[PDB]
UniProtKB/Swiss-Prot annotation:
Record-linked SMART domains: POLIIIAc (SM00481)
NCBIfam families xrefs: hisJ_fam (TIGR01856)
Catalytic activity of the protein: L-histidinol phosphate + H2O = L-histidinol + phosphate
Catalytic class of the enzyme: hydrolase
Entry's Gene Ontology molecular function annotations: histidinol-phosphatase activity
Biological process according to GO: L-histidine biosynthetic process
Name of the protein this chain belongs to: Histidinol-phosphatase
Keywords carried by this UniProt record: Amino-acid biosynthesis, Histidine biosynthesis, Hydrolase
C-alpha cells in the first residue's frame, strides 16, 4: 500500500497562509498520516507580492514539532520553490542555504506575470493558449533547472481563468506533456499528484493521463500533496488521488531526506 502522507502544504511561514504549523501536524495524526513534509513558498521577485521565507524561524519551529511528535509521525522540512530561470543563481543559493529535506519546483509566474485569476495572464487569451504558455514554461524549467526533487502541479493553470470550464486535457497538450514527462523520468525526478482540484472529475482524468504516460515514458517517482493552506483537508480528494496512483500501477510514493530519495 502507498504510505499515507502529504508532501505539499503551507503554513503561516508562507506569505499566503495563516495556519498554525502545529495544526497541520495534529490533523495529519488524526487522519493516520505516517509522514508529512511542510513545503513553504519561496518565490524570488514575485510580481506584486513578497513571497519570502524566514529560515531561522521556520527551521526552529518544524524542528520543535519533529521532537514533540517523534513517536507519532515523521515530519520533514521542505520547500516549494517558484522557478524563473532569470533568477537561477539566487534560487540555487537559497536552496543550498539550509538543510531542506525536499524541494518542489513550481511555475507560478511567467515573464513577471502571475498565473492567477484576474491577472494579465488570462486576459484576451484562449484557455488553450494559456495552457500552451504555461506548459512551455514548465518544460523550460525541467530542461534547465536541476536542484529539486518533484515537479509541482502541472495542472496549476487549470485553477484559474475567466472560462466556465477551466479544465486541462492531456490530448490537447500531448506533445509538450510527452517532452516534460520524458525529461522528468530521464532526470530521475518525481511527478507531483496535486489534489487541489481533485473534486472535479476532469482533474482526475488529466492526472490519470499524466500518470499513465509518465509510467510509459519511464517515470518511477511520484509525490502526493494537497496544496492545503489550512490544516483541515479534503480527505475524499486525497483518497481519489491515491486510488488513481494505484490504478496506474505505482506501488509506492517517494519520500525524501536531505533532498535524497528514501530507499
Ligand atoms: Zn500559496
Ligand atoms: Zn504552487
Ligand atoms: Zn503550494
Amino acid at each position: 500500500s502507498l504510505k499515507k502522507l502529504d508532501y505539499h502544504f503551507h503554513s503561516h511561514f508562507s506569505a499566503d497562509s495563516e495556519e498554525l504549523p502545529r495544526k497541520h501536524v495534529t490533523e495529519a495524526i488524526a487522519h493516520g498520516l505516517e509522514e508529512i513534509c511542510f513545503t513553504e513558498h519561496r518565490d524570488f521577485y514575485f510580481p506584486g507580492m513578497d513571497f519570502s521565507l524566514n529560515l531561522p524561524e521556520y527551521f526552529q519551529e518544524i524542528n520543535q514539532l519533529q521532537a514533540e511528535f517523534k513517536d507519532k509521525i515523521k515530519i520533514k522540512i521542505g520547500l516549494e520553490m517558484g522557478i524563473d530561470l532569470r533568477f537561477k543563481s539566487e534560487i540555487n543559493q537559497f536552496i543550498d542555504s539550509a538543510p531542506f529535506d525536499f524541494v518542489i519546483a513550481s511555475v507560478h509566474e511567467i515573464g513577471d506575470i502571475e498565473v492567477y485569476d484576474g491577472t494579465e495572464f488570462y486576459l484576451q487569451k484562449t484557455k488553450e493558449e494559456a495552457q500552451r504558455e504555461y506548459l512551455l514554461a514548465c518544460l523550460d524549467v525541467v530542461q534547465n533547472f536541476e536542484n529539486y526533487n518533484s515537479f509541482g502541479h502541472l495542472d496549476y493553470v487549470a485553477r484559474y481563468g475567466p472560462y466556465t470550464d477551466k479544465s486541462i486535457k492531456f490530448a490537447e497538450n500531448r506533445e509538450i506533456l510527452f517532452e516534460i514527462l520524458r525529461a522528468l523520468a530521464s532526470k530521475e525526478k518525481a511527478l507531483e499528484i496535486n489534489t487541489r482540484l481533485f473534486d472535479d472529475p476532469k482533474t482526475e482524468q488529466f492526472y490519470s493521463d499524466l500518470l499513465i504516460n509518465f509510467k510509459r515514458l519511464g517515470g518511477k517517482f511520484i509525490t502526493l500533496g494537497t496544496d492545503s493552506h489550512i490544516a483541515k483537508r479534503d480527505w475524499l480528494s486525497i483518497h481519489k488521488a491515491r486510488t488513481l496512483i494505484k490504478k496506474a500501477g505505482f506501488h509506492e510514493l517517494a519520500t525524501f531526506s536531505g533532498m535524497k530519495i528514501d530507499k
